[PDB]
Design a protein around this ligand. Sequence first.
Ligand SMILES: N#Cc1cc([N+](=O)[O-])ccc1O
Length: 250
Amino acid sequence: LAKRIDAALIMKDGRVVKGSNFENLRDSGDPVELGKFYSEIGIDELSFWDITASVEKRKTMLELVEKVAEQIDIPFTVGGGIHDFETASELILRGADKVEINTAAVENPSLITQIAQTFGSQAVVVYIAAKRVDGEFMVFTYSGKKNTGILLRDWVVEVEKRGAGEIVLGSIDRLGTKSGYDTEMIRFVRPLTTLPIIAHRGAGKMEHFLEAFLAGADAAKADSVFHFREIDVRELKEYLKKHGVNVRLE
Ligand SMILES: N#Cc1cc([N+](=O)[O-])ccc1O
């Protein structure tokens, strides 16, 4: 398929954490208005990742999904503390196209299969946060706090066997950097799975998107580079098409 450009919005209490620099918006911290804008300038998919407090979280995530589904017409995912099938199901039914799961899937891989049984593999995105430890790629849970001791190589294979539709490869080694996506990590995973690979963490300039697609990613996800306008989405898409990448333009 065409390569995909994804914008991720981190949220809390219904607000975009740290907003954005788009002065043309009524509320640059409103996820619906920001995501609608991205959908108009060439983002292919939106991912919303929620970190609100336990009490208000479930109702907050459902309201977000509901509000997004009304105004936005591109596919979108939702994630952040989705721990079980009933939570994932109610978010998809309320309007999300896919859910992103990480820690809960590592602790119970059958959760992938559960969700896929009812909603299809295409509704299940497994986010894999990985880091080099003593020379080997290991899987981390709990927002990067826990080395599971599971090898990336092994978790990828299991994720596909259990029925996931896509994998996000979040390189903890690149969090908060602008040096590029972890293309070595992407290239290590690419031969192990037939699933779409989404690159995450490290992007700082448009060239990094090209590098990740050459490494074998099928989609590239980023957030702050777009929200703080270090990279313009339509410039990025024109750049990638110029250099031979099959992306979608208007
Ligand atoms: N997608 C995604 C995503 C995942 C995590 N995470 O597994 O901490 C954090 C932020 C994100 O945007």
